[PDB]
């Protein structure tokens with residue numbers, strides 16, 4: 001009743017103020033948000049008891065200013081592992097915990113809505129923001145997102161799933177027209193958002209920068225209204241990506257309730273003030289008051305539940321120590337062991353020769369709106385020191401000295417905030433020979449960073465190893481292998497890189513991604529086996545970039561794309577590699593363990609409305625560990641073309657001791673089995689195959705069931 005009451009009290013002008021942000025806080029002419037560093041604020045209306053609501057990034061943790069002027073207090077937040085690493089956990093419960101921790105910091109720092117999680121599909125590994133997205137698969141993505149949203153919103157604050165939809169490249173994102181069939185949309189790109197919307201009920205959705213089939217997402221009625229609302233039954237409000245679109249009136253008409261951050265003229269001289277443009281449109285009858293009321297109601301019906309609406313006295317003192325444990329745990333389960341030829345874990349007291357500048361310049365996460373400002377960030381070297389591991393102390397000082405020297409130099413000093421990539425081959429061929437005799441093992445850090453606004457390139461030093469990185473690995477490998485010793489590589493990266501050319505040169509490979517503030521601790525602990533790797537890939541690692549099915553990336557013309565066509569359609573990520581027989585370097589769902597697991601006791605039953613899959617996993621190794629199991633369904637060929645198989649469920653065991661087992665029981669609604677034929681979802685009659693895998697290509701148990709009667713669903 002409150003909402004309809006406030007609504008009835010508002011004047012036309014106050015209503016317009018409410019659907020437009022107050023401008024980017026603390027930049028240009030604008031005052032700081034009462035939470036300094038926050039991404040945006042709504043217009044207050046004291047008249048009718050509406051406060052300003054505060055919105056802030058981001059996916060890796062709350063992003064606000066750590067300090068404030070005329071203030072002795074401190075406002076640090078927890079920097080969690082990046083989303084691609086969180087997805088690697090394949091652990092819903094854990095993602096929910098990460099949401100709660102973040103949510104407590106959101107609430108207690110006076111924020112009302114967290115601008116997370118990001119959940120665009122990994123269409124192409126070069127997308128600059130892949131690090132802060134979950135997966136190339138909509139079920140993994142949707143399920144991780146749902147868990148995170150539930151976590152955040154258990155804390156009395158709102159989540160915001162973004163970016164809706166098909167924002168799968170950074171190049172010309174604010175302008176590019178994304179051409180995608182309705183089938184690709186419904187099966188791949190819309191699909192994760194559908195799951196999140198239906199299962200977790202996020203307070204808000206952020207419409208994407210890009211056009212979708214001719215229309216800006218922020219101004220796309222089919223997207224924000226027919227699909228989101230009418231079909232899916234979304235009950236929240238939609239906000240625009242910052243400065244997205246070109247027409248505030250079209251945005252409101254489309255179902256984009258909240259225009260952020262407001263004052264677009266401050267960034268684009270050709271935009272009018274949106275309040276003035278809207279007021280004029282109302283005056284002229286270009287926009288009806290009824291549409292305006294709907295947008296305002298969508299906003300209030302959600303935000304009357306925000307802490308700010310009840311004048312919540314936030315503490316400015318969240319439990320950072322408790323949240324750090326959660327960040328460490330998330331990182332611990334998200335590391336992916338890609339290769340282990342009797343190399344890991346390291347023996348106790350093993351003397352480590354630590355290589356690569358990334359050991360010191362460790363990447364905690366990518367740049368942009370999804371960045372964070374934690375009190376600390378434990379480098380790989382620091383974590384190893386902290387845990388008291390036996391490392392070459394002379395070498396570590398050499399690296400420290402070399403980085404200082406290089407970063408002080410003109411060519412490599414941080415510019416404007418990028419740090420030029422350092423040469424990694426500064427050690428002499430004889431210096432490394434000395435290292436091989438002195439130490440027991442080699443550990444080489446390979447680091448990459450990416451971020452909002454920039455796409456990566458299929459070139460050396462980016463997707464490919466730079467020549468100096470290749471030379472370092474070759475030399476270290478040769479030297480240490482001659483001495484009978486093992487070499488380990490740590491991939492401190494945010495998205496796939498080439499691995500085929502060098503992986504056979506080394507014995508161990510740990511994909512440690514970018515693990516936030518606790519990175520070095522997580523990494524050290526994985527090396528010694530205190531952590532048993534349980535992460536599995538949420539995205540495909542291709543042998544070569546030319547293998548990638550999304551070849552049109554980043555569009556036409558390449559250097560200034562006005563449009564990009566998803567030629568590969570539904571056949572993206574593993575759906576492509578499986579269906580057309582292209583072998584990846586490492587497949588979707590792949591990941592090793594320090595122990596072994598045996599799958600057994602498969603039972604499959606379909607009562608016509610629910611597919612029930614049960615099996616048993618036993619730890620047959622000598623170290624406790626968790627196992628991620630994946631259930632792929634292979635639908636019959638029947639009427640329409642379909643991928644080879646599709647992930648429909650997944651699970652992760654508790655921490656099993658040697659000899660322990662766990663019974664897995666998963667249920668899949670019949671509707672989930674459907675393919676979209678362009679008009680409707682269809683679950684074709686026929687024999688289906690259940691494929692329970694330790695990865696999409698390591699199937700451990702197979703069974704079948706039959707659909708007797710075709711089922712159809714209109715969107």
Ligand SMILES: OC[C@H]1O[C@H](O)[C@H](O)[C@@H](O)[C@@H]1O
Pocket residue numbers: 039057115162240241242243369
């Ligand atoms: O920082 C506010 C927003 O700015 C941009 O729209 C980013 O794409 C979005 O992810 C972020 O939440």
Ligand SMILES: [Br-]
Pocket residue numbers: 119120121165166167168189190
């Ligand atoms: Br997407």
Ligand SMILES: [Br-]
Pocket residue numbers: 338339503
């Ligand atoms: Br391998």
Ligand SMILES: [Br-]
Pocket residue numbers: 131448449450493494495
């Ligand atoms: Br990266």
Ligand SMILES: [Br-]
Pocket residue numbers: 552555556563564565
């Ligand atoms: Br194209």
